[PDB]
A paper describes a structure:
Here we identify several potent neutralizing antibodies directed against either the N-terminal domain (NTD) or the receptor-binding domain (RBD) of the spike protein. To understand the structural basis of RBD recognition, crystal structures of representative group A, B and C mAbs in complex with the RBD were determined.
As expected, binding of RBD mAbs from competition groups B and C were less affected by these mutations as their epitopes lie outside the ACE2 binding interface. RBD mAbs targeting epitopes outside the ACE2 binding interface, such as [name]-2057, [name]-2063 and [name]-2151, were also able to neutralize all [name]-[name]-2 strains tested, albeit less potently than [name]-2125.
Numbering used by the authors:
A (entry chain L): 1 to 9, 11 to 27, 27A, 27B, 28 to 66, 66A, 66B, 67 to 211
B (entry chain H): 2 to 122
C (entry chain A): 331 to 532
């Protein structure tokens, strides 16, 4: 019959202290316990704080939870911020009939080391050429921020028709990665000298080139 | 070493869905835990579906009480989940988690399973 | 050497609850306490154990366990907690800052509220000083709020200390009766007799 409200996003430097509030929309927040969950990119959530202040054995003591009586909300405090803590956090409570989670909070650690991405270009296999298709795969990974613009060419000229690309998401290394493709036929794959996959990240560009035989 | 979800991922829209959560290493007949279901759309927040205590007392989400029923059988030591009249919004990764004695924090989670509602044969 | 179950039902299922100012305390010892009957029921609107593990209660032996029972209105339930202010915490029922136990409360509008108003339930509104924790006062002497002495409730600065509730079924939820039960866990250099099912002395 109630809800729990969490901030849109928070951000702080490594080793610092951040706070996330869990506001209740109906009723007293002190009626029952409120919990917190840490969900890393892709994997399952995990309890960090329960009973509004309690940590299970195995959770670092850097996490802590307190109460704000006036604002009808509890708060999760994370001292000594580390880049491994960069994940999503939810708060959960029970009010006499229902278990209700919060909206969520996107925690971002400032400073994760920014750098240029890494590019890899593959030559299409011969079995695909015998399958009425041809694909040049371009893998991008290990870059922050997760913003990147891609470009393709053919014999030094812009040819980008039939291109598939997925927006960057976070990988298992707390970093970002993506992948770009290029759709061709067997005849038009070998008819051109070579193709290119240009990758631009914060103005820095890096390209790769593959040939039919070389 | 306890929980893991089932494998009927694909579900046709306007039809029903069924998932099972097997519990290894521990008797569900030893009713000292609640057993809940949690789902989340791709890149969205968690939503509670329902819990079940082996004593028979069931709790369902009010937005889903018309379509959701949760059962459990000790013959195979697992608890199921029925989501009838599925819609496009039900595309989510369904986690099954263990809840401790008190109605507090979920102790043992699974790893979820993504169900999708679309039409391709 | 101990098999009888603790009579938690004699407190929660009691026909009537004593007034909040004259809160009724019951001592419990020499029994096996199944707390799972309490911390798993969904009928309780407020269940918060302060100072103890609420799930690991069935593993602990205690010297004595005290159960206090009374009724207040909904917006005063927040005062039954360590470190609180208000007419109930300051003057009626005060928990210490290191309270070791559980606070249980549930709505009782269909029990304690009679048609037209239940004035059987009372609570203290004026007192000389704040109550020390776990102090039970019953003195109904005229409270003197001014420099002029009092003999009889007439005249200003002279009020009757106890105030009665107006519990009706039509009242708002914030002003509806809420039966409250507080469990106090005490451990001393004495035989621990209030154990859970899976305890250590067994
Ligand atoms: C108070 O009364 C209720 C109602 O009779 C008791 O709940 C019963 O408990 C027994 C034993 O667990 C069950 O067999 C009944 O089915 C229950 N009845 C209902 C309506 O739930 C309860 O045990 C009593 N004591 C307390 C402390 O609540």
């Amino acid at each position: 019959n109630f809800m729990l409200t969490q901030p849109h996003s928070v951000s702080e430097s490594p080793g610092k202290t951040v706070t996330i509030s869990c506001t209740r929309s109906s009723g007293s927040i002190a009626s029952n316990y409120v919990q917190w969950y840490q969900q890393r990119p892709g994997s399952a959530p995990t309890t960090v704080i329960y009973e509004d202040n309690q940590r299970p054995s195995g959770v670092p003591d850097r996490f802590s939870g307190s109460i704000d009586s006036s604002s009808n909300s509890v708060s999760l405090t994370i001292s000594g911020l580390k880049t491994e803590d960069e994940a999503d956090y939810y708060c959960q409570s029970y009010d006499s009939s229902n278990w209700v989670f919060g909206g969520g909070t996107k925690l971002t650690v400032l400073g994760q080391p920014k750098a240029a991405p890494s590019v890899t270009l593959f030559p299409p296999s011969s079995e695909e050429l015998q399958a009425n298709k041809a694909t040049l795969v371009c893998l991008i990974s290990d870059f922050y921020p997760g913003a990147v613009t891609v470009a393709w060419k053919a014999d030094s000229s812009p040819v980008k028709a039939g291109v598939e690309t997925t927006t960057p998401s976070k990988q298992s290394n707390n970093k970002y990665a993506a992948s770009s493709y290029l759709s061709l036929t067997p005849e038009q794959w070998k008819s051109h000298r070579s193709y290119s996959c240009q990758v631009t990240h914060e103005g820095s560009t890096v390209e790769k080139t593959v040939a039919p035989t070389e | 070493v306890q929980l893991q979800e089932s494998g009927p991922r694909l579900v046709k829209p306007s039809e029903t869905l069924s998932l099972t959560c097997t519990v290894s290493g521990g008797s569900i007949s030893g009713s000292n835990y609640f057993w809940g279901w949690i789902r989340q759309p791709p890149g969205k927040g968690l939503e509670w579906i329902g819990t079940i205590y082996y004593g028979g007392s069931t709790y369902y989400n009010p937005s889903l009480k018309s379509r959701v029923t949760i059962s459990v059988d000790t013959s195979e030591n697992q608890f199921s989940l029925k989501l009838s009249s599925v819609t496009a919004a039900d595309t989510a990764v369904y986690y099954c988690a263990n809840l401790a004695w008190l109605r507090g924090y979920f102790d043992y989670w699974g790893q979820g399973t993504l169900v999708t509602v679309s039409s391709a044969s | 050497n101990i098999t009888n179950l603790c009579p938690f039902g004699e407190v929660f299922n009691a026909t009537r609850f004593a007034s909040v100012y004259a809160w009724n305390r019951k001592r419990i010892s020499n029994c096996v306490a199944d707390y799972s009957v309490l911390y798993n029921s969904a009928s309780f609107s407020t269940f918060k154990c302060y100072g103890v593990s609420p799930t690991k209660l069935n593993d602990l032996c205690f010297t004595n366990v005290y159960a206090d029972s009374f009724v207040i209105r909904g917006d005063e339930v927040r005062q039954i907690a360590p470190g609180q202010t208000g007419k109930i915490a300051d003057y009626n029922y005060k928990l210490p800052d290191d309270f070791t136990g559980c606070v249980i409360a549930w709505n009782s509008n269909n029990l304690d509220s009679k048609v037209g108003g239940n004035y059987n339930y009372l609570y203290r509104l004026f007192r000389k000083s704040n109550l020390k924790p776990f102090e039970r006062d019953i003195s109904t002497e005229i409270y003197q709020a001014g420099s002029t002495p009092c003999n009889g409730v007439e005249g200003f600065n002279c009020y009757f200390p106890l105030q009665s509730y107006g519990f009706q079924p039509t009242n708002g939820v914030g002003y509806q009766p809420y039966r409250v039960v507080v469990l106090s866990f005490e451990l001393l250099h004495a035989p621990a007799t209030v154990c859970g099912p899976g305890s250590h002395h067994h």
